[PDB]
Structures are given as C-alpha cells and as structure tokens.
Amino acid sequence: RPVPFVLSFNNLTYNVTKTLLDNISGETRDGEILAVLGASGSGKSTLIDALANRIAKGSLKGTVTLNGEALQSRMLKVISAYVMQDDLLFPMLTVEETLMFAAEFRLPRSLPKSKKKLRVQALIDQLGIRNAAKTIIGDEGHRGISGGERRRVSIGIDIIHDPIVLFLDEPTSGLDSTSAFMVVKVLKRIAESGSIIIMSIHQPSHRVLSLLDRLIFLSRGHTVFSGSPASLPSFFAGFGNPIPENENQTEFALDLIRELEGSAGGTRGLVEFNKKWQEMKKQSLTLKEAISASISRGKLVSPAFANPFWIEIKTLTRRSILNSRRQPELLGMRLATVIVTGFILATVFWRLDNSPKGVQERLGFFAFAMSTMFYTCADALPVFLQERYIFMRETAYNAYRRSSYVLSHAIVTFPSLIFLSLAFAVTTFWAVGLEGGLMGFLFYCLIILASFWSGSSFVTFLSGVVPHVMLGYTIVVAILAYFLLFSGFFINRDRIPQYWIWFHYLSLVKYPYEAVLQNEFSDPTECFVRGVQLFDNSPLGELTYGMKLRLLDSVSRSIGMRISSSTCLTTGADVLKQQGVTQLSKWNCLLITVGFGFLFRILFYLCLLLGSKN
C-alpha cells in the first residue's frame, strides 16, 4: 500500500591510509528496519555517515543505489534525514512548540500554518507523546519530560519533512530498556508507512527484535552477518558456534564477535563464510514518479532555505524571547551583579568632592564601572555554548542561515542590555555625583549600553572559538583584565612602551573609560584646584592660610600674572591632559565602542563559517 523503495548499497570502500570500510554490500526495503551492529566503534557509524554522504566524495568508492538506479547528494538531502546521537533541544519550549519551530524552519512557507499545524499534530500521534504535548522539555534543573521521551522529540524534529530514507546514529543510546523499546516501536511505526530506516543499534534488547527486520554485523570494516534475525540462530549454528535457546539473541552473536578480537582468533574466518552464506538463498523504475507517488501518499512535505532571511530572524527571535521568558533567573543573575555592583560602587564612591583625591577616585570609579559591563556579560558562556550546538545541528538541515543566526542572536540580547544599562546608570550617577546634569546622564546611559554591547559581542565571539565553558572563562577573565591594564587607568597612553601601544589601541575597555572621562571632566565652571589649593600635598603645602597668600602673591611677582584664591588653576580640561585622554572625542570613543561590538559579530560569523564547514 505504500510506494515500494529499494536502497541497495554495494562495494563500499572508505579509506582515510586506513581503509576504515572494505566491501560492504547491502539491500533495504521500506517497511523494514536495517540495523547495523558493531562492537565499540567497528564502523557501524561511518557506515551511516557513508550512506548519508557525510564524509567525502573521492575518499569513498562504491555505487549507492536507490530503486535500481544511481544516487547523488542532491536527491539524498531532500529525501533523507540524519539523526545525530544527541538530544540538543532547548530546555524550555514544551513539545508542541519545539516541533512547531522545526516546522516553520524546514517545511516550506507556501504551506499555510493550518496544514503545518496538523503535520505537527500527525507527527505528535505517530510519535508516542501525547502526555508530553503540553509539558516543558525540561533539562536537569527544571524536570519536565522523560529521558527516553526526549529522544522521540529529537528524532521527531528530523522527521518534520517526512523523509523516505531515515539514517539514525544510535537512537537508543543512554536509554533504559523499556523506553528504548518505544523508540524503536515508533520507528517501525514510521517504517510501517513508506519509510526506509537504516539505524545503528548498540547492543539491542530482547523485546526490540520483534521490529528489526534485517541486520548487518561489522568487524572493522568487514561484514560478518547480514540477514534477518530469524536466520541468526541458523547462521551461527552452521558456522561452528551454536546458539543457546531461551536466551537473548543478537547479544550472544555480538560478544562472540568480541571474543574473536584476540591475538590469533580473528573474524577473518567469518568474512568468507559470510560470502558463502549469501549464495545459498537465491531460491527465487523511474524513482521520481515513485517519489511523486510517495508525495501523494502523504510523505515529503518539503529551495536552498525554506524562508527568506527576514522570517528566519523573527522565528529565531520568538524562539529565544520565549525560552528566556520561561527561565527568568538568567536575567536575575546578570541583574543581581549589576544592582549589587551598582549599589557597592555608589556607596563607596558616595558623593565625591572636587579634591585631588576625589579626581583620582573618579578615574578609579570609571575604570571599575566600565569593566563591570564586560564581566557581567561573561556569565552567558553557559547559554552561548548551549546553542551553537543546536545551531550546528539545525544548519545540517538548512533550517536557517548563519547570517540570519548572528543577526537574531544580537537582537534578543539587546532588550536585556538596555535594562541592565539603566539599572547601573540610575544607581551610580546621582549617588557618585557625576557631572553633566541630564545630557551627561544620557551619555552615561549610552556608553554603559555600548559597553554591554561590545562586551557581550566579545564573549559571543569567544563562544565560537572555545570548546567548553570553563576554558572560555579563564581566558575571558584573563583578557578583560589585560584590557583593563591597557585602558589608560593603570598606566597612561603616553607612558605605555612602543612595543605595547598596538594593544593599548586594541583594548575594549580603553574607549568606554575614555568616554566617561570626557563626559565628566569637560565643564569649564567646575574647578578641582582653586588658588590656595596649589600647595596641598607637597612638603611645601602643610602651611596655614596666612602665609599661603604671601606665598601666592610672590608667585604673581615672578611671571607677570596675578594669582589669587579665586583663580581656578586646574579645571576638568587639565585633568584630561594629565591622563593623556586627548586623542578622541567622547562620541568617537562611543563610536569605537559600538564598532568593536560589530567587529566581534562579523568575526563571530566567520568562525561559524569555518567551524561548521570543517
């Protein structure tokens, strides 16, 4: 009643030299489940990777055939689906929405959402999940569905377009033996429609072999047994190792392979008996209209991408402002280190005066404040490396572009950066007593938000060159401490040596720290040294007010000027010349702060161009 398909791979030789696979031939129908078995890395996978064309063309030789005719990689990516050995899903997003996000990414948009809603409703019944249709997927801290019932969802994402041939790389690994049965029970329920399934089971159970209809055993790139599980007693009995009854088949037959991994035993005594066993059982058409008949059966619901790049952006935004709504303790940890640091910094540096020490306390406030923006965003390396393992899975199916992923991941962090930036700028502006009034408050809000923007762009760029969270945190703290050393606070710009001046200008803390200094120390009325404050902290300077004016009028008798106690010697424009903060305006220091944000999002896109292509 389905349309009959025949996949028949032949003479596969995969070399890398290594000769990792050597002369594997096979045949599969629909209705059946071809299971490929191996011991611990025998080549069970790298045969699933070889039949899905996921290795190389040229390093594999051998005709892969479907319906008795040749097969190229253009047809096997609209017709097939490879299910990786993971469950990389978002921890929120209940399982009607996980499969509806994967619906709109991958099913074409010429379909209405009305037909697309029942395709997910057909799939949610074909899978054995209706108790979990309204419950959260639920990672280790927010438990919401079962472990082997997550597996039918990640399997179900890849069958959103209802493929014909379905490659699965160990779909029952890490599952208990009674939920791994219902995985293979719904897999044959998929295969009871017009579907070919080539999966690589690691050590099947006993109740599962009511479903597997054809087996292949591999010993380091050589086939050892190839046939039905009913012929599995009759094969091993005729080889010289009979089978114990009332005992689990396909386990006795599999560790007997492993005992022949000895020094002189060898499975080479099995590879030519496998060649003589095939000879004794010979007892005795335009696939694109067979595909077109199998589209009209109801399969193959699925262009390079199924959406333009302005619908993949609002699908990836809606998916991540809904995954982040349902756990508001990520913006309760990036906000309880901004309110907490904003309360500490505003009460230590409470109402700083116009003193020579209060000037040096402003530079110490502005360097500790403008480094909080770069550390606060470092507490997203858990979630930034949580996706890009989901992105690397979803771009194998061409669900969205990599350009459309960076532009959507930059957008959704930005409403949570505006609220962190005016929670630090409301706390530490009227308490520290910063200068500017209101147009100098809005610049303080702007440069906090632009330092959150380039500090979250820098650590989303590193999350994309690092493999794990803990390595990409001890070099986030190490780089953002060398960015602070070179900001011009610890050592000024004109005192940094010539061989280190390239890294002064490449510092991400240099440009916001120099922007809050010109926002604060540019006021012609504010005076930090007034006349008889000239002699304060030198040995000349512990005098009294009486002889200070004779000391000050005598200086007036030496240059030709007239200096009094109302002369306003050191303004705010001379504080900046003492620090070397004279090369750029505060808006050009706000431009380079934003322009280093956009640099690590173009450099992030190029590391998605390399690490996903390789």
Place this chain on the structure above:
Amino acid sequence: RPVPFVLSFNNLTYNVTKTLLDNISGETRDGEILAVLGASGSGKSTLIDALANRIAKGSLKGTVTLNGEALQSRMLKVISAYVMQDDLLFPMLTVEETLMFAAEFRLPRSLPKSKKKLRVQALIDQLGIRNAAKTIIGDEGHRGISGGERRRVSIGIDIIHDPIVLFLDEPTSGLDSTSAFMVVKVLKRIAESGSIIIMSIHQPSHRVLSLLDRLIFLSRGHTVFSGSPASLPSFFAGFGNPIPENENQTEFALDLIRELEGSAGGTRGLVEFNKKWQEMKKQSLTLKEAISASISRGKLVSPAFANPFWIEIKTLTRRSILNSRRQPELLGMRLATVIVTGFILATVFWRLDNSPKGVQERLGFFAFAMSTMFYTCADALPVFLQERYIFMRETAYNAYRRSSYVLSHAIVTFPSLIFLSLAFAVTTFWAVGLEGGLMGFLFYCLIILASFWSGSSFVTFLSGVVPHVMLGYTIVVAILAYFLLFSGFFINRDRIPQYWIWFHYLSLVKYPYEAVLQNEFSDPTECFVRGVQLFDNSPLGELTYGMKLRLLDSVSRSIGMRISSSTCLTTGADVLKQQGVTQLSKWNCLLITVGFGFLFRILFYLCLLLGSKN
C-alpha cells in the same frame, strides 16, 4: 564450606510524614545475591539505605536480624560496606595503586605491607581486571581502562576489608549489557565466598539472571514479588498475567508493575497476593564466633581510624604528588598565566622612573601584580571540587580524618606555589626595577608566596561551600574584584566611608598590596620630587628652569627655610602618607596575609564538619 550467615529484615517501616517504606520483610543467605527491583524510585534504594542504617534511627521501625540475633550500627560498620552509585576515582593512579591506597587507609597497620600487597593481589584476581592492573584509570581526556572496568575498581575499593554483607546501590548503572554482566559475575564470585550481597539493580538483562538467587520487587514501599527468579514465571501466571516464553523475564514482570501505576489499576491488587503466596511455600548460632570462624576463613581483614594522623598525611600526600606528576598540564596552566602575566607586567611597566607618574604606575603595578596571585589559584576549582566528592566517599569508611585531609591538601599545593612565586618575582623585579636590592627581593618573593597561599586557601574554602565549578567561579571573580576595589588602590583607606570600612579591613588584597608598597617606598635616599620638580603638573609647571630657582627662592623667603634644587621634598615615606599606607608594617601586612590563609583553612575544616554530617 564458608561460614553460613543469614540476614533477615522484618516489618521495616520508614517514615519521613511520607511513609516511604512500610512492612518490608525478607531473608538472605550467604552464597546468594538478593536483588531489589523497582521502577524509577520505588524504594529500591532507601531500602539499601535502610538496611545499612544510613538514614535515621527512630524514623525507621523494624527489627533487622543477622544469624537470628539483633543487629546494631556498631557491628554493621565493621562487617559491611555500602557501594554508592558513582565511580569517583582519581583519573591517574593505575589500578594496582588505587586499590593499594585504599588498602593502607582502611586495612589496619598491624598488618605488614607484605600481607597487604597480596590482599590487593587476591582482590585483583577476584575482580576480573588483570589486563588493567598496570593501566591508568583514565578520565575522559586521558583514557586508560574501560567504563565497566572502572566499576569493578570502585566496587573493589569497598571490598578492601572483605566484608560479609555488601550493600550496593545500583552497581550496574551506566554500563553496557556485556560489561555489566561481568560486574555481576564477579559479584557472585565474591558471593561464592562467605559473602551476603544485597544490591538494587535497575532493569537487569537476560544473561544476568543465572546469578541472582533471590528477588524483591517494590511498588512505592510495598513488596510485590519476593522469591527466586525460577519462581517468577510461576508467580505471575497464578496472579492472572502469564509470562511469554523466549522473552526476557524480570523485564516483562517489571514493566507490568509500571503498567499498574495508572489512575485506577493500582499495585494494591498485588500486595495481598504477595501475602498469600508466601503462605503456600512452607512445605519444609552465636554470631560473634560465626564472625570469628569467618575471619579464619580469610575474610574480615580489618579502632576508629586504622592509622594515626601522621601516616594519613603522608598517604594523602603521596597520593596527590603522584596524581599531579602524571598530569603536568595543571602546573602548565597555572604557570602559563604567571610567566605570561609576569612577562606582560614587566614589559609594560619596564624600568619605571622616579616621576610623579611613575609613582602612580608603581601602585598600579603592585595592585595588578598582587591580584594575579588570587586569580591564578582560582583555576583549581575543577580539581578542588574533583576531590571532596572523593573525600566524602572515603570518610564514610573512616579512611582518614577530615583534619588530616585539610593538612594534607595544604601541604601538597605548597611546592607548586613556591615555584609560581619565584617565577613571578624573578620576571617582575629587575625589569620593573623595584627597590630594595636583595633583602627587598626576598620580601617580594615572600609576599608573592603568601598571597598565593592566601588566595589558594580562599578558593579551597569556597570549594566546600559551592556545589559546582561554574557558580564557584563567577563569585570568585566577583569577590576578588571587590577585594581589589577595597585594597586601597581605587579609593584610599581614609576616604572609604564608615559603613564600608569593615570590608576594607576584611580584604585579602589589602594586606599584600600594602606590603609591597612599604617594601618599595621605604628608602631615605630615593627621591621622587627634587626641588624644582615642585611645579610640574599645575599651571605652575610649564615654566622655564632659569627663573624657577628664584620662584623657589621666593618660597624660601616666605617660610624661613631654604629650598634649592637639591632639597628632596617628596621621599618614599611621603608617598605612603599620601596613600594612607601607615597603619601596619610590612611584616605585619605579611602576617595578616598568612593569617588569612590559615583562617580559610580552619573555616574550610568547619564546612567539612557541617556538609558531611548533613
């Protein structure tokens, strides 16, 4: 041929109220394996915790009986061993040494090591590991033995004293079905000696029921089936649900238990049939000399602790200076952030002059240098939380004291802190051009080592109040940044407000930063402002030198002193009074740096006193 033991628990009611267990009766022999089965938390464990007295006395009611005699917790800790559901071993330490460290901790020291070396040799043959007797245990990055051959070592650690009754909490979880067979094969080989084994399997295989001799099934604290696995077809057939042949028993009979966890099915229809099935099968000695006869058989090789506290210190030292030699990339990451930061800090701050800016660059060097000591030791939170999960396992068996664990963990870090402290002090002393000569170099070496010691003691104290590495790193960087803000570098001591002065004095960076300042700025010959350097960076200060002497002679005609270009106004003793660094000597700032190291190792011992008694 062994000494016959019986264990016979009766009428166990465990309440917490909850009534987690009620009226569980049973009986076990030596020679046999009692397996307790349940679905997903039925009470299979917390019956193993109930029979090992590992929950509460008073919240458990019911007599636990051995050899027809009562049993108390003093006897079941010399006679028994509880095997937790983990494999927490050191990743190095090949398996002849892992079991020989557990030998010397737990076997008594009146034994010579000659008998103790063959007790490990008898155990390594009783276990099925002789191919792995000379290979490293091998964690995920440095693989050396199998996944199921780690399980026989962690099981083997707890049988180092060769107990009689052996409780195992899921000893075959996370194992493939053919290495989990050899776990239960060596368990019955242990049980073929005079050993009682009460283990709680999760969904056993088919080839394993040749080894289990008695079963107990639990449904939310109620026994359901209790008997041999041979009687497991005959029980369910007489209940009303017959068994399919050529199919795995104890899996059919266990998912049928989960089927009766429905809305109106209930396993209460099984609990009184379990009361009538026990009635139909009744067709039909001085324990402490039975133990004494079972010592002379060769069991019970095993005082509160088996060693005084000066041999537990050198056993824990030899175990960790051998685990750390075999991975010298832990002291190649704490040393490539000290040579790298030492090379960066010594080339930015290369040869600082006696200038008003070079004085402020010394305080910025000394505050960035003395904070490197506290961050470099923060890259040990992976390994500090790697043990204290091995310590919490090994103090259930009284292998070592918790006082003897802190004193041994402080000792072995100290030869790696001396080498990091003179790699930072050789790099950044003659390049930055620090003052003191040679007796001011040895103090620079001392206060770097005392800040490594204080900052490795602070993060070993937090590793002991935090549950995981990633939480105990974003609050290590956050606290050691607020320690740096309050050190007196960003805001001075006499400018910190009165409500924040308690945290200035509690700052761990305050005392080494103030110790390198008095080591540097205490020299009566070094001068930072000389006579006509009085007017440098004021509006007075863009003058010419030719008139500056009469600008300075006019000062001399205003106080009564005589100032010239050789007066030496600002020495190093006046730099310290301008910073407020006047309250303690440099040795009393070195004492409090060491005394905060010893405080977070006494506070670490108290958090091992709380979290382990919990």
